[PDB]
Amino acid sequence: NLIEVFVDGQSVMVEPGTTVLQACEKVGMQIPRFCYHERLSVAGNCRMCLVEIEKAPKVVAACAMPVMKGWNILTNSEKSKKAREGVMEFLLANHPLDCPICDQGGECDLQDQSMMF
Amino acid sequence: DTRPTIRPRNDVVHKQLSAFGQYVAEILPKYVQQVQVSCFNELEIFIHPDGVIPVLTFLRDHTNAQFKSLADLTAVDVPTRQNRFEIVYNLLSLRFNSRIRVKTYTDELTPIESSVTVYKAANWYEREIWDMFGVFFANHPDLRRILTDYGFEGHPFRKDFPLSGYVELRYDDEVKRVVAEPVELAQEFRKFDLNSPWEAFPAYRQPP
Amino acid sequence: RTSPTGEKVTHTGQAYDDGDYRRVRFSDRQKEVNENFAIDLIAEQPVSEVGSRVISCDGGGGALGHPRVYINLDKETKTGTCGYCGLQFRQPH
Amino acid sequence: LKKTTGLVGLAVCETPHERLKILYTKILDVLGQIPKNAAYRKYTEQITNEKLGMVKAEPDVKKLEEQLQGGQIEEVILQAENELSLARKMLRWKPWEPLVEEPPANQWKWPI
Amino acid sequence: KLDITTLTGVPEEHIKTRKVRIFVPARNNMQSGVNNTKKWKMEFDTRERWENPLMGWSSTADPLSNLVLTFSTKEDAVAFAEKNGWSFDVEERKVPKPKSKSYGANFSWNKRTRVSTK
Amino acid sequence: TYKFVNMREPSMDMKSVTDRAAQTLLWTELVRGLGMTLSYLFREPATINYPFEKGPLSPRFRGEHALRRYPSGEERCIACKLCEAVCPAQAITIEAEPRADGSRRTTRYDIDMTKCIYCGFCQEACPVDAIVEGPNFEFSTETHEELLYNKEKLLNNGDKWEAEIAANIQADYLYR
Amino acid sequence: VKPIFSRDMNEAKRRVRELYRAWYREVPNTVHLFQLDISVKQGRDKVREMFMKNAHVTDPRVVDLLVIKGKMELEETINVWKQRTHIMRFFHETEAPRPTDFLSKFYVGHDP
Amino acid sequence: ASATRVIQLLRNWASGRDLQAKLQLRYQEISKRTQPPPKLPVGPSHKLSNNYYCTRDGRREAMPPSIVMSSQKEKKAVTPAPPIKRWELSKDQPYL
Numbered sequence A: 001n002l003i004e005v006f007v008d009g010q011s012v013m014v015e016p017g018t019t020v021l022q023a024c025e026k027v028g029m030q031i032p033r034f035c036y037h038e039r040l041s042v043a044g045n046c047r048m049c050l051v052e053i054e055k056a057p058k059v060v061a062a063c064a065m066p067v068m069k070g071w072n073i074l075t076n077s078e079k080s081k082k083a084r085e086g087v088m089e090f091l092l093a094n095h096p097l098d099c100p101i102c103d104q105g106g107e108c109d110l111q112d113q114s115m116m117f
Numbered sequence B: 001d002t003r004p005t006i007r008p009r010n011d012v013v014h015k016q017l018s019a020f021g022q023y024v025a026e027i028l029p030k031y032v033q034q035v036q037v038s039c040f041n042e043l044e045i046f047i048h049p050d051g052v053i054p055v056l057t058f059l060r061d062h063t064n065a066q067f068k069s070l071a072d073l074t075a076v077d078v079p080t081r082q083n084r085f086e087i088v089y090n091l092l093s094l095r096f097n098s099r100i101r102v103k104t105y106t107d108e109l110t111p112i113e114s115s116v117t118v119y120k121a122a123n124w125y126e127r128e129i130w131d132m133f134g135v136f137f138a139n140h141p142d143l144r145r146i147l148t149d150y151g152f153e154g155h156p157f158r159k160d161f162p163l164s165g166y167v168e169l170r171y172d173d174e175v176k177r178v179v180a181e182p183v184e185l186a187q188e189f190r191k192f193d194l195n196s197p198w199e200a201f202p203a204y205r206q207p208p
Numbered sequence C: 001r002t003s004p005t006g007e008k009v010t011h012t013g014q015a016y017d018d019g020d021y022r023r024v025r026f027s028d029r030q031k032e033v034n035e036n037f038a039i040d041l042i043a044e045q046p047v048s049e050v051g052s053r054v055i056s057c058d059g060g061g062g063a064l065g066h067p068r069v070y071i072n073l074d075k076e077t078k079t080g081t082c083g084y085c086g087l088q089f090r091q092p093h
Numbered sequence D: 001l002k003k004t005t006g007l008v009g010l011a012v013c014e015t016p017h018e019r020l021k022i023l024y025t026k027i028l029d030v031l032g033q034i035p036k037n038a039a040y041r042k043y044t045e046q047i048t049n050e051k052l053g054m055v056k057a058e059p060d061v062k063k064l065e066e067q068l069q070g071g072q073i074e075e076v077i078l079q080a081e082n083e084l085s086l087a088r089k090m091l092r093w094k095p096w097e098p099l100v101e102e103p104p105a106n107q108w109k110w111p112i
Numbered sequence E: 001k002l003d004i005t006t007l008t009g010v011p012e013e014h015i016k017t018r019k020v021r022i023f024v025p026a027r028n029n030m031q032s033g034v035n036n037t038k039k040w041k042m043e044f045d046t047r048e049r050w051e052n053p054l055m056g057w058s059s060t061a062d063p064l065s066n067l068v069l070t071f072s073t074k075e076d077a078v079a080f081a082e083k084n085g086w087s088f089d090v091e092e093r094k095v096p097k098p099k100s101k102s103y104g105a106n107f108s109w110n111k112r113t114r115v116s117t118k
Numbered sequence F: 001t002y003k004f005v006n007m008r009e010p011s012m013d014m015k016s017v018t019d020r021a022a023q024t025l026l027w028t029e030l031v032r033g034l035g036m037t038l039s040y041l042f043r044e045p046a047t048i049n050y051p052f053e054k055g056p057l058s059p060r061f062r063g064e065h066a067l068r069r070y071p072s073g074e075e076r077c078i079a080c081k082l083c084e085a086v087c088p089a090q091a092i093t094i095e096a097e098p099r100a101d102g103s104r105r106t107t108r109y110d111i112d113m114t115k116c117i118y119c120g121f122c123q124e125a126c127p128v129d130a131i132v133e134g135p136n137f138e139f140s141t142e143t144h145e146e147l148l149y150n151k152e153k154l155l156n157n158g159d160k161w162e163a164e165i166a167a168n169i170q171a172d173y174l175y176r
Numbered sequence G: 001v002k003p004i005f006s007r008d009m010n011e012a013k014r015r016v017r018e019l020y021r022a023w024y025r026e027v028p029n030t031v032h033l034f035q036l037d038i039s040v041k042q043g044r045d046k047v048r049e050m051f052m053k054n055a056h057v058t059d060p061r062v063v064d065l066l067v068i069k070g071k072m073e074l075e076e077t078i079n080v081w082k083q084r085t086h087i088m089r090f091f092h093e094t095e096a097p098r099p100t101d102f103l104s105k106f107y108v109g110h111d112p
Numbered sequence H: 001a002s003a004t005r006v007i008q009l010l011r012n013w014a015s016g017r018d019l020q021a022k023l024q025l026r027y028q029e030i031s032k033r034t035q036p037p038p039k040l041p042v043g044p045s046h047k048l049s050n051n052y053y054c055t056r057d058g059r060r061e062a063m064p065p066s067i068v069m070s071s072q073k074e075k076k077a078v079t080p081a082p083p084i085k086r087w088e089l090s091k092d093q094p095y096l
């Protein structure tokens, strides 16, 4: 029953219904995410999980979009990088400069994801 | 890419180093196990530990490889490998204005041939390697502690050796001498966990 | 303030107890105590009244202050307090 | 005649061409002892033949030095001596043999 | 069995009394990254950390208090502990089970999964 | 590209040999050196009259650490503890608790100057310009315990040197 | 595996005995040289104690390296490279004896 | 320097050089310690457009070392690099 999808050109077998983010986790790629939680219902609002699929005009939400057989998930493509950068810019646009006084400082997903993506 | 932030990379030296690495591998298939050129144009030859003297002698005397200067001989302790200690030889060829690295592996017990015959500078470097890491060098003219204290026990640079050590010194009036006592720190060295939970470099990702 | 033992209490609420042997360290030497309690000093500072719903405080002096933070004044009973400076701002009633 | 080689411990050779020819012949013989398949023999014979041909062709010491691109002719003589000694040591070592042993598992894996 | 204990130089007290724990570090619940939880690590038992009388700074005599060694595989850590003669306790790596996730289930027709708010 | 130091053949001209022998016998070069030192004797000495005269110093000078305050009088330190992290000698020990008001105010800011390397990373890291190395280099003590500076000591140092510290920061903040 | 010096344990024991003889004969001189307050018996007792500490070793390679380290300490002692304190460091004196009885350890502290 | 002309002449003669021209002590050629407030410039990436970090992330453009040869599964002689060219004697001052 497993469909053959590709992550960055690497073939990976996934059960039908697997989200793009889960397949990327299978190959070892942790797509940046803020709203998606493994034990919480999929939301798709943060828009930080956007990733490019080969031969696809629009980036898809890896946290929600289920994989389709034959899809090549370009996790580190320019489209994906720019999408992540733009979404992080939007997230930080109104975020207060509270890092020195924020207890989450040093262990903030926002901080690390901004620093990495 | 381009722009000042990115470091300019010279491909010509990369090609030259790759060609010379293949040259060395062909000349010495008995010992050369792997040849790598880093993206910053640094040729590295991995050699079986038995080939320390032959490979270095070739890289020193050969007309087309005149690496007659031992820049630095060091060791890297990786405890996750059976041969934890990795002996690295950094060489320099003035004739061809190039550098090369010979990397070999060794255990805590397996001896490694001394390269003093090849390079006289190897004496003190190998003494340091033995003193800090504990890699015994066979046929060494004088292998002894060079940097630690005379009565010191243990090899400090080993990854399993504590940073503060096991013993400390102080002067005791009763014995009228400097005595060694078990280490007691007034303030423990505060270990800081800094590694981020998010991957930083996708290019160097190890597949599960 | 001064403890019952006679040892001045620091702004960190620290005062060697009577049973504390460490009190001997001040036998012939003074106990360094700062005499400008910060908490009292800001309490002196008046509460500014700014009509705008949201105000920003940099601590004064621009680059010589603290990272600019925007404070909301919707709460009527409470007064918006600077995260770094501690200055209180209010919206005129 | 060159007064001094500049390098301390290196002396000017009055007959550099003859010395180089003799050394190159010795080197070529030692390489001939080496098995033909060995890459060392092939490459070293190529290099020595080039240098010997240039040495015989050019009688002027300075022009020969420029031609060989090995520095001063005394330095080239030293290089030839080193190569000859290396060739003998190679005959002893036989590095043209197959690999002694493959590296154990991931002995060359970085990062861990 | 390689016996490097005599060559390590570790005092006998810190060769026998020590209780090495081989484990994979757990993911900090505050963050969602898993890069830290990818390599086996070896740590020693925690011991007394009293207070320095002069300043109140925490003092310790444990020389191996801060020693943490990362290992590619569990077998590597086990072998390293055996070489150094340290009693080692191994905790098997806990990998989160794959979880089926459906955005459509949030809008189910006759299932509890239907979300009340978005 | 390369210059030959020494590498100068001596001329064997009888005049040149005569002058060389004159140098050897009459000790000419020794007299030349002696005259050079005599010239140094009549120069003006470069000694400053310490402590009545102090040596030149720049506003960026790094010295005794000091904790600063906002103009209102509140401690700038908001207990981010990043100066503790950046400190390459692990000299800063910071413990903080919510103050009675509710702000991030440290209950312990201890730096042992006997372990600090006076690098200045602490002042470069502080996001509120609280910990700033002052201009005082003359703070030698007679007992080791004195070097270990408490939070109270740092606050007092800040209060004492605030004028100069503020002036120097005002004179250097643009460069930073 | 290549042996460090001794192929067999019997060969290693030969090296151990050779080292023990040298240490045994050096102890009287060492007391004279460093003007130690220990007796010749005390030093020789310590030598035997140190040798007996590593008496559980079974690998000839490890025994070889232990002998090499033992030689190095002897070389420093003979060459007066060590100082008086260095020689006395073997005789732990200032260090307070740590008890072995569980009840004593229970009183002393949280020692595991 | 505040020295008498006689002292200056004696000093220069003993040294053999005009020391007053280059006196080691600094008097007034020193720059004023108080300086005008500076305005340091911005870097090449201080722009509001075409500034995506993906186009300037040199740290993430590094690649693992290329494996030229691995033992695990007529050529001309090759030197590590072209031989170094002989240095040329200085023209300002060939022999010190």
Ligand code: SF4
Binding pocket: F076, F077, F078, F079, F080, F081, F082, F083, F084, F094, F125, F126, F127, F128, F129, F130, F131
């Ligand atoms: S860096 Fe500044 S604000 Fe942060 S703890 Fe240190 S002194 Fe306080």
Ligand code: SF4
Binding pocket: F065, F086, F087, F088, F089, F091, F092, F111, F115, F116, F117, F118, F119, F120, F121, F122, F123, F133
């Ligand atoms: S100046 Fe350097 S040594 Fe001193 S407290 Fe700051 S970081 Fe530590």
Ligand code: FES
Binding pocket: A032, A033, A034, A035, A036, A043, A044, A045, A046, A047, A048, A049, A050, A061, A062, A063, A064
């Ligand atoms: S993780 Fe929120 S949109 Fe994908």
